[PDB]
Amino acid sequence: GNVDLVFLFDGSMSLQPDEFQKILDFMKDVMKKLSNTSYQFAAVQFSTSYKTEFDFSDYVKWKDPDALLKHVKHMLLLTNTFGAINYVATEVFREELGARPDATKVLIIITDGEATDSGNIDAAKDIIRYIIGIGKHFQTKESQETLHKFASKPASEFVKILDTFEKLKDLFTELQKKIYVI
Ligand SMILES: O=C(/C=C/c1ccc(Sc2ccccc2OCc2cccnc2)c(C(F)(F)F)c1C(F)(F)F)N1CCOCC1
């Protein structure tokens, strides 16, 4: 019944300042819409390294997406997606950071490029994983296919490709049409 959701967002060199900002604003829009629900949130920036920008405990105490992401600094390096997903699985989904042990775990990965690392995501198998690929780096079918290995199956449900960062607004509009009292 409880949902612990992690935004895992790309901070690579390829992102223009306005594009990075549009990611931040998308995340804030989602959190504001799902205030006072069974959702609790954490946000992790990934590039070459990984940083928990705020954790679940932070969200519970402040419930203020604007304040929680206010100190985010764009890393401007690579795109270590494998390492990032593993970091979330092992280092973020923990009591110490306010994760609830019996909650449904969800990961929202937001990226504008292919992974610069390798390996596996076995550690994250118990997490429902969605991935949003954004921009000109994902023009080809082949490039989009590379993201499937990070998301839950089927790709038709868990993988979304956006032409531009402006389309995050459209995605947020679409998302809200899927909100229900169950
Ligand atoms: O809380 C959630 C999920 C929330 C969620 C899901 C996706 C996404 S993005 C996404 C990324 C890839 C593909 C589509 C996507 O969204 C469109 C969509 C969603 C659901 C149904 N139809 C269209 C998002 C996003 F955060 F907006 F990115 C969420 C949530 F907002 F809730 F956190 N769930 C579903 C799994 O079981 C627990 C409840």
Coordinates of N, CA and C and ligand atoms in Angstrom, one line a residue:
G1 N 0.8 -1.3 0.0 CA 0.0 0.0 0.0 C 0.8 1.3 0.0
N2 N 1.9 1.3 0.8 CA 2.9 2.4 0.8 C 3.8 2.3 -0.5
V3 N 4.1 3.4 -1.0 CA 5.0 3.5 -2.2 C 6.2 4.4 -1.8
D4 N 7.4 3.8 -1.9 CA 8.6 4.5 -1.8 C 9.2 4.7 -3.2
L5 N 9.2 5.9 -3.7 CA 9.6 6.2 -5.0 C 10.9 7.0 -5.1
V6 N 11.8 6.6 -5.9 CA 13.1 7.3 -6.1 C 13.1 7.9 -7.5
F7 N 13.4 9.2 -7.6 CA 13.7 9.8 -8.9 C 15.2 9.7 -9.0
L8 N 15.7 9.0 -10.1 CA 17.1 8.9 -10.4 C 17.4 9.6 -11.7
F9 N 17.9 10.8 -11.5 CA 18.0 11.8 -12.7 C 19.5 12.1 -13.1
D10 N 19.6 12.1 -14.5 CA 20.8 12.3 -15.2 C 21.3 13.7 -15.0
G11 N 22.6 13.8 -14.6 CA 23.3 15.1 -14.5 C 24.5 15.2 -15.4
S12 N 24.4 14.6 -16.6 CA 25.6 14.5 -17.5 C 25.9 15.8 -18.2
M13 N 27.1 15.9 -18.7 CA 27.6 17.1 -19.4 C 26.8 17.5 -20.6
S14 N 26.1 16.5 -21.2 CA 25.3 16.8 -22.4 C 24.1 17.7 -22.2
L15 N 23.6 17.7 -20.9 CA 22.4 18.5 -20.6 C 22.7 20.0 -20.5
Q16 N 22.0 20.8 -21.3 CA 22.0 22.2 -21.2 C 21.4 22.6 -19.9
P17 N 21.8 23.8 -19.3 CA 21.2 24.2 -18.0 C 19.7 24.2 -18.0
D18 N 19.0 24.7 -19.1 CA 17.5 24.7 -19.1 C 16.9 23.3 -19.1
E19 N 17.6 22.4 -19.8 CA 17.1 21.0 -19.8 C 17.2 20.3 -18.5
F20 N 18.3 20.5 -17.8 CA 18.5 20.0 -16.4 C 17.4 20.6 -15.5
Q21 N 17.2 21.9 -15.6 CA 16.1 22.5 -14.9 C 14.7 21.9 -15.1
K22 N 14.4 21.6 -16.4 CA 13.1 21.0 -16.8 C 12.9 19.7 -16.1
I23 N 14.0 18.9 -15.9 CA 14.0 17.7 -15.2 C 13.6 17.9 -13.7
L24 N 14.3 18.9 -13.1 CA 14.0 19.3 -11.7 C 12.5 19.7 -11.5
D25 N 12.0 20.5 -12.5 CA 10.7 21.0 -12.4 C 9.6 19.9 -12.6
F26 N 9.9 18.9 -13.5 CA 9.1 17.8 -13.7 C 8.9 17.0 -12.3
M27 N 10.1 16.7 -11.7 CA 10.1 16.0 -10.4 C 9.3 16.7 -9.4
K28 N 9.4 18.0 -9.3 CA 8.7 18.8 -8.3 C 7.2 18.8 -8.6
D29 N 6.8 18.9 -9.9 CA 5.4 18.8 -10.3 C 4.7 17.5 -9.9
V30 N 5.4 16.4 -10.1 CA 4.9 15.1 -9.6 C 4.7 15.0 -8.1
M31 N 5.7 15.4 -7.4 CA 5.7 15.4 -5.9 C 4.6 16.2 -5.3
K32 N 4.4 17.4 -5.9 CA 3.3 18.3 -5.5 C 1.9 17.7 -5.7
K33 N 1.8 17.0 -6.8 CA 0.5 16.4 -7.2 C 0.2 15.3 -6.2
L34 N 1.2 14.6 -5.8 CA 1.1 13.4 -4.9 C 1.4 13.7 -3.4
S35 N 1.3 15.0 -3.1 CA 1.4 15.3 -1.6 C 0.3 14.6 -0.8
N36 N 0.6 14.4 0.4 CA -0.3 13.8 1.4 C -1.0 12.5 1.0
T37 N -0.2 11.7 0.3 CA -0.6 10.4 -0.1 C 0.2 9.3 0.5
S38 N 0.1 8.1 0.0 CA 1.0 7.0 0.6 C 2.3 7.0 -0.1
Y39 N 2.6 7.9 -1.0 CA 3.9 8.1 -1.6 C 4.9 8.8 -0.7
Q40 N 6.1 8.4 -0.7 CA 7.2 9.1 -0.1 C 8.4 9.1 -1.1
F41 N 9.1 10.2 -1.1 CA 10.1 10.4 -2.2 C 11.5 10.6 -1.8
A42 N 12.4 10.1 -2.7 CA 13.9 10.5 -2.6 C 14.3 10.8 -4.0
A43 N 15.4 11.7 -4.1 CA 15.9 12.0 -5.4 C 17.4 11.9 -5.4
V44 N 17.9 11.2 -6.4 CA 19.3 10.9 -6.6 C 19.8 11.4 -7.9
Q45 N 20.8 12.3 -7.9 CA 21.5 12.7 -9.2 C 22.6 11.7 -9.5
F46 N 22.6 11.3 -10.8 CA 23.7 10.5 -11.3 C 24.4 11.1 -12.5
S47 N 25.7 11.0 -12.5 CA 26.5 11.3 -13.7 C 27.7 10.3 -13.7
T48 N 28.9 10.7 -13.3 CA 29.9 9.8 -13.1 C 29.8 9.2 -11.7
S49 N 29.5 10.0 -10.7 CA 29.2 9.6 -9.3 C 27.7 9.8 -9.0
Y50 N 27.3 9.4 -7.8 CA 25.9 9.4 -7.4 C 25.7 10.2 -6.1
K51 N 24.7 11.0 -6.0 CA 24.4 11.8 -4.9 C 22.9 11.8 -4.5
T52 N 22.6 11.4 -3.3 CA 21.3 11.5 -2.8 C 21.0 13.0 -2.4
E53 N 20.2 13.6 -3.2 CA 20.0 15.1 -3.0 C 19.0 15.3 -1.9
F54 N 18.0 14.5 -1.7 CA 17.2 14.4 -0.5 C 16.7 13.0 -0.3
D55 N 16.5 12.5 0.9 CA 16.0 11.2 1.1 C 14.5 11.2 1.6
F56 N 14.0 10.0 1.9 CA 12.6 9.8 2.3 C 12.3 10.6 3.6
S57 N 13.2 10.5 4.5 CA 13.1 11.2 5.8 C 13.0 12.7 5.6
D58 N 13.8 13.2 4.7 CA 13.8 14.6 4.3 C 12.4 15.0 3.8
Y59 N 11.9 14.2 2.9 CA 10.5 14.4 2.3 C 9.4 14.4 3.4
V60 N 9.5 13.4 4.3 CA 8.5 13.3 5.3 C 8.5 14.5 6.2
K61 N 9.7 15.0 6.6 CA 9.8 16.1 7.5 C 9.4 17.5 6.9
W62 N 9.8 17.7 5.6 CA 9.6 19.0 5.0 C 8.4 19.1 4.0
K63 N 8.2 18.0 3.3 CA 7.0 17.9 2.3 C 7.0 19.1 1.4
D64 N 8.2 19.5 0.9 CA 8.4 20.8 0.2 C 9.4 20.5 -0.9
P65 N 8.9 20.0 -2.1 CA 9.8 19.7 -3.2 C 10.7 20.9 -3.7
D66 N 10.2 22.1 -3.6 CA 11.0 23.3 -4.0 C 12.3 23.4 -3.1
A67 N 12.1 23.3 -1.8 CA 13.1 23.4 -0.8 C 14.1 22.2 -0.9
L68 N 13.5 21.0 -1.1 CA 14.3 19.8 -1.1 C 15.3 19.7 -2.3
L69 N 15.0 20.3 -3.4 CA 15.9 20.3 -4.6 C 16.6 21.6 -4.8
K70 N 16.5 22.5 -3.9 CA 17.0 23.9 -4.0 C 18.6 23.9 -4.1
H71 N 19.2 23.0 -3.5 CA 20.7 23.0 -3.5 C 21.4 22.0 -4.5
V72 N 20.6 21.5 -5.5 CA 21.1 20.6 -6.5 C 22.1 21.3 -7.4
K73 N 23.3 20.8 -7.5 CA 24.3 21.3 -8.5 C 24.6 20.3 -9.6
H74 N 24.4 20.8 -10.8 CA 24.6 19.9 -12.0 C 26.0 19.4 -12.1
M75 N 26.1 18.1 -12.1 CA 27.4 17.4 -12.0 C 28.3 17.6 -13.3
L76 N 27.6 17.5 -14.4 CA 28.2 17.8 -15.7 C 29.3 16.8 -16.2
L77 N 29.1 15.5 -15.9 CA 30.1 14.5 -16.2 C 29.5 13.4 -17.1
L78 N 29.7 12.1 -16.8 CA 29.3 11.0 -17.6 C 27.9 10.5 -17.3
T79 N 27.6 9.2 -17.6 CA 26.2 8.7 -17.5 C 26.3 7.3 -17.0
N80 N 26.7 7.1 -15.7 CA 26.9 5.7 -15.2 C 25.7 5.1 -14.6
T81 N 24.8 4.8 -15.6 CA 23.4 4.3 -15.3 C 23.4 3.0 -14.5
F82 N 24.2 2.0 -14.9 CA 24.3 0.7 -14.1 C 24.7 1.0 -12.6
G83 N 25.8 1.7 -12.4 CA 26.3 2.1 -11.1 C 25.2 2.8 -10.3
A84 N 24.5 3.7 -11.0 CA 23.4 4.6 -10.4 C 22.3 3.7 -9.9
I85 N 21.8 2.8 -10.7 CA 20.7 1.9 -10.3 C 21.1 1.1 -9.2
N86 N 22.3 0.5 -9.2 CA 22.8 -0.2 -8.1 C 23.0 0.6 -6.8
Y87 N 23.4 1.8 -6.9 CA 23.5 2.7 -5.8 C 22.2 2.9 -5.1
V88 N 21.1 3.2 -5.9 CA 19.8 3.3 -5.4 C 19.3 2.1 -4.7
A89 N 19.5 0.9 -5.3 CA 19.1 -0.4 -4.7 C 19.7 -0.7 -3.4
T90 N 21.0 -0.4 -3.3 CA 21.8 -0.7 -2.1 C 21.9 0.4 -1.0
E91 N 22.0 1.6 -1.5 CA 22.3 2.8 -0.6 C 21.1 3.7 -0.3
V92 N 20.0 3.6 -1.1 CA 18.9 4.6 -1.0 C 17.7 3.9 -0.3
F93 N 17.4 2.7 -0.8 CA 16.3 1.9 -0.2 C 16.8 1.3 1.1
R94 N 16.8 2.1 2.2 CA 17.3 1.8 3.5 C 16.5 2.5 4.6
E95 N 16.3 1.9 5.7 CA 15.7 2.6 6.9 C 16.4 3.9 7.2
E96 N 17.7 3.8 7.2 CA 18.5 4.9 7.6 C 18.1 6.2 6.8
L97 N 17.7 6.0 5.6 CA 17.2 7.2 4.7 C 15.7 7.4 4.7
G98 N 15.0 6.6 5.6 CA 13.6 6.7 5.8 C 12.7 5.8 4.9
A99 N 13.3 4.9 4.2 CA 12.6 3.9 3.5 C 11.8 3.0 4.4
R100 N 10.6 2.6 4.0 CA 9.7 1.8 4.8 C 9.9 0.3 4.2
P101 N 10.2 -0.6 5.1 CA 10.7 -1.9 4.6 C 9.6 -2.8 3.8
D102 N 8.3 -2.6 4.1 CA 7.3 -3.3 3.5 C 6.6 -2.6 2.3
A103 N 7.1 -1.4 2.0 CA 6.6 -0.6 0.9 C 6.9 -1.1 -0.5
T104 N 6.0 -0.8 -1.4 CA 6.3 -1.1 -2.8 C 7.4 -0.1 -3.3
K105 N 8.5 -0.6 -3.9 CA 9.6 0.3 -4.3 C 9.4 0.6 -5.8
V106 N 9.5 1.9 -6.1 CA 9.5 2.4 -7.5 C 10.7 3.3 -7.8
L107 N 11.2 3.1 -9.0 CA 12.3 3.9 -9.5 C 11.9 4.6 -10.8
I108 N 12.1 5.9 -10.8 CA 11.9 6.6 -12.1 C 13.2 7.2 -12.5
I109 N 13.7 6.6 -13.6 CA 15.0 7.0 -14.1 C 14.8 8.0 -15.3
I110 N 15.5 9.1 -15.2 CA 15.4 10.1 -16.2 C 16.7 10.4 -16.9
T111 N 16.9 10.2 -18.2 CA 18.2 10.2 -18.8 C 18.1 10.8 -20.2
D112 N 19.2 11.4 -20.6 CA 19.4 12.0 -22.0 C 20.4 11.3 -22.8
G113 N 21.0 10.2 -22.4 CA 22.0 9.5 -23.1 C 22.2 8.0 -22.7
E114 N 22.9 7.3 -23.5 CA 23.2 5.9 -23.2 C 24.2 5.8 -22.0
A115 N 24.2 4.7 -21.3 CA 25.1 4.4 -20.2 C 26.5 4.4 -20.7
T116 N 27.4 4.9 -19.8 CA 28.8 4.9 -20.1 C 29.5 3.8 -19.3
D117 N 28.7 3.1 -18.5 CA 29.3 2.0 -17.7 C 28.6 0.6 -18.2
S118 N 29.0 -0.4 -17.5 CA 28.5 -1.8 -17.8 C 28.3 -2.6 -16.5
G119 N 27.8 -3.8 -16.6 CA 27.5 -4.6 -15.5 C 26.1 -5.2 -15.6
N120 N 25.4 -5.3 -14.4 CA 24.1 -5.8 -14.3 C 23.3 -5.0 -13.2
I121 N 22.0 -5.2 -13.2 CA 21.1 -4.6 -12.2 C 20.3 -5.6 -11.4
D122 N 20.9 -6.8 -11.2 CA 20.3 -7.8 -10.4 C 19.8 -7.3 -9.0
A123 N 20.6 -6.4 -8.4 CA 20.3 -5.9 -7.0 C 19.0 -5.1 -7.0
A124 N 18.5 -4.7 -8.1 CA 17.3 -3.8 -8.2 C 16.1 -4.6 -8.7
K125 N 16.2 -5.9 -8.8 CA 15.1 -6.8 -9.3 C 13.8 -6.7 -8.6
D126 N 13.8 -6.3 -7.3 CA 12.7 -6.1 -6.5 C 12.0 -4.7 -6.5
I127 N 12.6 -3.9 -7.5 CA 12.1 -2.5 -7.7 C 11.3 -2.5 -9.0
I128 N 10.2 -1.8 -9.0 CA 9.5 -1.5 -10.3 C 10.1 -0.3 -10.9
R129 N 10.7 -0.5 -12.1 CA 11.6 0.5 -12.7 C 11.0 1.1 -14.0
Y130 N 10.8 2.4 -14.1 CA 10.4 3.1 -15.3 C 11.6 3.9 -15.7
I131 N 11.7 4.1 -17.0 CA 12.8 5.0 -17.6 C 12.2 6.0 -18.6
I132 N 12.6 7.2 -18.5 CA 12.3 8.3 -19.4 C 13.6 8.7 -20.1
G133 N 13.6 8.4 -21.4 CA 14.8 8.8 -22.3 C 14.4 10.1 -23.0
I134 N 15.2 11.1 -23.0 CA 14.9 12.4 -23.5 C 15.9 13.0 -24.5
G135 N 15.4 13.4 -25.7 CA 16.2 14.2 -26.6 C 16.8 13.6 -27.8
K136 N 17.6 14.3 -28.5 CA 18.2 13.9 -29.8 C 19.1 12.6 -29.7
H137 N 19.6 12.3 -28.5 CA 20.4 11.1 -28.4 C 19.6 9.8 -28.6
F138 N 18.3 9.9 -28.5 CA 17.4 8.8 -28.6 C 16.5 8.8 -29.9
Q139 N 17.1 9.3 -31.0 CA 16.4 9.3 -32.3 C 16.2 7.9 -32.9
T140 N 17.2 7.1 -32.7 CA 17.2 5.8 -33.4 C 16.4 4.7 -32.5
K141 N 15.8 3.8 -33.2 CA 15.2 2.6 -32.5 C 16.2 1.9 -31.6
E142 N 17.4 1.7 -32.2 CA 18.5 1.0 -31.5 C 18.9 1.7 -30.2
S143 N 19.0 3.0 -30.2 CA 19.3 3.8 -29.0 C 18.3 3.6 -27.9
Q144 N 17.0 3.6 -28.3 CA 15.9 3.4 -27.4 C 15.9 2.0 -26.8
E145 N 16.2 1.0 -27.6 CA 16.3 -0.4 -27.2 C 17.3 -0.6 -26.0
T146 N 18.4 0.2 -26.0 CA 19.4 0.1 -25.0 C 18.9 0.4 -23.6
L147 N 17.8 1.2 -23.5 CA 17.2 1.5 -22.2 C 16.4 0.4 -21.6
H148 N 15.9 -0.5 -22.4 CA 15.0 -1.6 -22.0 C 15.6 -2.4 -20.8
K149 N 16.9 -2.7 -20.9 CA 17.5 -3.5 -19.9 C 17.5 -2.9 -18.5
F150 N 17.2 -1.6 -18.4 CA 17.2 -0.9 -17.1 C 15.8 -0.9 -16.5
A151 N 14.8 -1.0 -17.4 CA 13.4 -0.9 -16.9 C 12.7 -2.2 -16.7
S152 N 11.6 -2.2 -16.0 CA 10.8 -3.4 -15.9 C 10.2 -3.7 -17.2
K153 N 9.6 -5.0 -17.4 CA 9.0 -5.4 -18.6 C 7.5 -5.4 -18.5
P154 N 6.8 -5.1 -19.6 CA 7.4 -4.8 -21.0 C 7.8 -3.4 -21.1
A155 N 8.7 -3.1 -22.1 CA 9.1 -1.8 -22.5 C 8.0 -0.9 -22.8
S156 N 7.0 -1.4 -23.5 CA 5.8 -0.7 -23.8 C 5.1 0.0 -22.7
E157 N 5.3 -0.5 -21.5 CA 4.7 0.0 -20.2 C 5.7 0.9 -19.5
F158 N 6.9 0.4 -19.4 CA 7.9 1.0 -18.5 C 9.0 1.9 -19.1
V159 N 9.0 2.0 -20.5 CA 10.0 2.8 -21.2 C 9.2 3.9 -21.9
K160 N 9.6 5.2 -21.7 CA 9.1 6.3 -22.4 C 10.2 7.1 -23.1
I161 N 10.0 7.5 -24.4 CA 11.0 8.3 -25.1 C 10.4 9.6 -25.4
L162 N 11.1 10.7 -25.1 CA 10.6 12.1 -25.3 C 11.5 12.8 -26.3
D163 N 10.9 13.5 -27.3 CA 11.6 14.2 -28.4 C 12.4 15.3 -27.8
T164 N 11.9 16.0 -26.8 CA 12.5 17.2 -26.2 C 12.2 17.3 -24.7
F165 N 12.9 18.2 -24.0 CA 12.6 18.4 -22.6 C 11.3 19.1 -22.3
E166 N 10.8 19.9 -23.3 CA 9.5 20.5 -23.3 C 8.4 19.5 -23.1
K167 N 8.7 18.3 -23.7 CA 7.7 17.2 -23.6 C 7.5 16.6 -22.2
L168 N 8.3 17.0 -21.3 CA 8.1 16.6 -19.9 C 6.8 17.2 -19.3
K169 N 6.4 18.4 -19.8 CA 5.1 19.1 -19.5 C 4.0 18.2 -20.0
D170 N 4.1 17.7 -21.2 CA 3.1 16.8 -21.8 C 2.9 15.5 -21.1
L171 N 4.1 15.0 -20.7 CA 4.1 13.7 -19.9 C 3.4 13.9 -18.5
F172 N 3.7 15.1 -17.9 CA 3.0 15.4 -16.6 C 1.5 15.5 -16.8
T173 N 1.0 16.1 -17.9 CA -0.4 16.1 -18.3 C -1.0 14.7 -18.4
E174 N -0.3 13.9 -19.2 CA -0.7 12.5 -19.4 C -0.8 11.7 -18.1
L175 N 0.3 11.9 -17.2 CA 0.4 11.2 -16.0 C -0.8 11.4 -15.1
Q176 N -1.2 12.7 -15.0 CA -2.3 13.1 -14.1 C -3.7 12.4 -14.5
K177 N -3.8 12.0 -15.8 CA -5.0 11.3 -16.2 C -5.0 9.9 -15.7
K178 N -3.9 9.4 -15.1 CA -3.8 8.1 -14.6 C -3.9 8.0 -13.1
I179 N -4.2 9.2 -12.5 CA -4.4 9.3 -11.0 C -5.8 8.9 -10.6
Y180 N -6.0 7.9 -9.7 CA -7.3 7.4 -9.2 C -7.2 7.2 -7.8
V181 N -8.4 7.4 -7.1 CA -8.7 6.8 -5.8 C -9.1 5.3 -6.1
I182 N -8.3 4.4 -5.5 CA -8.6 3.0 -5.7 C -9.5 2.5 -4.7
Ligands
LIG1 O1 3.3 4.9 -8.6 C1 3.3 4.2 -9.6 C2 4.0 4.7 -10.8 C3 4.1 6.0 -11.0 C4 4.7 6.7 -12.2 C5 4.9 5.9 -13.3 C6 5.6 6.4 -14.4 C7 6.1 7.8 -14.4 S1 6.8 8.3 -15.8 C8 6.6 7.2 -17.0 C9 7.7 6.4 -17.4 C10 7.6 5.4 -18.4 C11 6.4 5.2 -19.0 C12 5.3 5.9 -18.6 C13 5.4 6.9 -17.6 O2 4.3 7.6 -17.2 C14 3.1 7.7 -18.0 C15 2.1 6.6 -17.5 C16 2.2 6.1 -16.2 C17 1.3 5.2 -15.8 C18 0.3 4.7 -16.8 N1 0.3 5.2 -18.0 C19 1.1 6.2 -18.4 C20 5.9 8.5 -13.2 C21 6.5 10.0 -13.2 F1 6.9 10.2 -12.0 F2 5.6 10.9 -13.6 F3 7.5 10.1 -14.0 C22 5.2 8.0 -12.1 C23 5.0 8.8 -10.9 F4 4.6 10.0 -11.3 F5 3.9 8.4 -10.3 F6 6.0 8.9 -10.0 N2 2.7 3.0 -9.6 C24 2.7 2.1 -10.7 C25 3.4 0.8 -10.2 O3 2.8 0.3 -9.0 C26 2.9 1.3 -7.9 C27 2.1 2.5 -8.4

